[PDB]
C-alpha cells in the first residue's frame, strides 16, 4: 500500500495430516518494508 | 549552473498515464504516442522519454 510492504507472520503448532486446521488464530504485523517496488507477480522456493 | 550548459538532470517528457504518490519509474523505454504501435529505437511519433 503506497509503497509499504507489510509481513504478517505466525508460528502455530499443529497436529494434522492433510486437512487445513479448524479454529481461529490472530496475526501480528511483524515487519514494514519500506522499499516501494513495482510488483505485479511472485514465485516460491523449493 | 554551468556556463556550458548542465545536461546532467534528465527529466521525462512522455509517460503514458498519471503516476501514484512516492512511485518512482525508471524504464526509459521509447514512448508510442502515435496511433499506431512502435518499436526499434526511433520513429514519427517514437521520442526519446
Redo the contacts between chains.
Keep these: 500500500i503506497?509503497?509499504y510492504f507489510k509481513i504478517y507472520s505466525k508460528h502455530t503448532p499443529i497436529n494434522l495430516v492433510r486437512g487445513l486446521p479448524q479454529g481461529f488464530s490472530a496475526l501480528e504485523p511483524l515487519v514494514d518494508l519500506p522499499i516501494?517496488i513495482?510488483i505485479t507477480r511472485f514465485q516460491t522456493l523449493l | 549552473s554551468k556556463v556550458g550548459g548542465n545536461h546532467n538532470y534528465l527529466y521525462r517528457l512522455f509517460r503514458k498515464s498519471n503516476l501514484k504518490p512516492f512511485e518512482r519509474d525508471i524504464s526509459t523505454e521509447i514512448y508510442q504516442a502515435g496511433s499506431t504501435p512502435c518499436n526499434g529505437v526511433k520513429g514519427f511519433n517514437c521520442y526519446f522519454p
Design positions: 503506497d509503497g516501494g513495482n
